[PDB]
Amino acid sequence: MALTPALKTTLDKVVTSHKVVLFMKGTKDFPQCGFSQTVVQILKSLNAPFESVNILENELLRQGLKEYSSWPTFPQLYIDGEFFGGCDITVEAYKSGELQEQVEKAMCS
Numbered sequence: 560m561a562l563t564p565a566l567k568t569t570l571d572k573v574v575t576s577h578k579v580v581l582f583m584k585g586t587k588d589f590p591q592c593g594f595s596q597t598v599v600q601i602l603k604s605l606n607a608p609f610e611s612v613n614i615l616e617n618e619l620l621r622q623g624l625k626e627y628s629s630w631p632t633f634p635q636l637y638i639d640g641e642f643f644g645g646c647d648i649t650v651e652a653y654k655s656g657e658l659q660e661q662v663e664k665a666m667c668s
Contacts, residue, residue, distance in 0.1 A: 562619045570627065573610060574640060578665050581611040582624050582635040589613075594646035595634045601653050602636075605662055639665035 574580055579602055581587075583595035587610060590596055595611070602609050614621045614633055628635060628642035636643040643649065643661065652658035 560619065562623045566617075566619050566623060567627065570612075573612070574637065577608065577610045578639050579607050579609045579662070580637040581609050582614055582620075582633055582637065583611055584613065584615050584633070585611060586613050587611040598634055598636055598646050598649050601649060601658070602662065605653070605659060607662060607666075638662060639668060 570580075581595070581599060581602075583591060583598075585591040585595060590599060590611065599609055599611065612620065614624060624633075624635060625631060628637065630642050630644050632645060634646055636645070636649055638661065643652075643658070649658055652661070
């Protein structure tokens with residue numbers, strides 16, 4: 560199967576080429592409303608880019624991105640080689656200053 564030799568290799572190339580990555584049911588050119596749009600708008604507004612990868616384009620993404628993090632369900636936020644979690648975690652952390660700190664940490668490494 561392509562998951563371990565090619566797909567995780569592609570995700571690592573995406574993660575190292577672009578420091579902020581989103582896993583959701585849409586792309587950066589065609590987003591989805593609610594949780595995904597909220598997570599995307601928060602990161603954008605903090606002052607940052609984002610690479611939204613569409614999970615529904617391949618069953619190896621839809622199944623494998625749960626194990627790539629260890630976090631259950633989507634949308635899922637990922638930064639500079641580590642996952643952050645879902646929209647509820649993102650919204651409470653942005654209000655608490657913890658996402659702001661960790662996204663700045665994802666920029667400086």
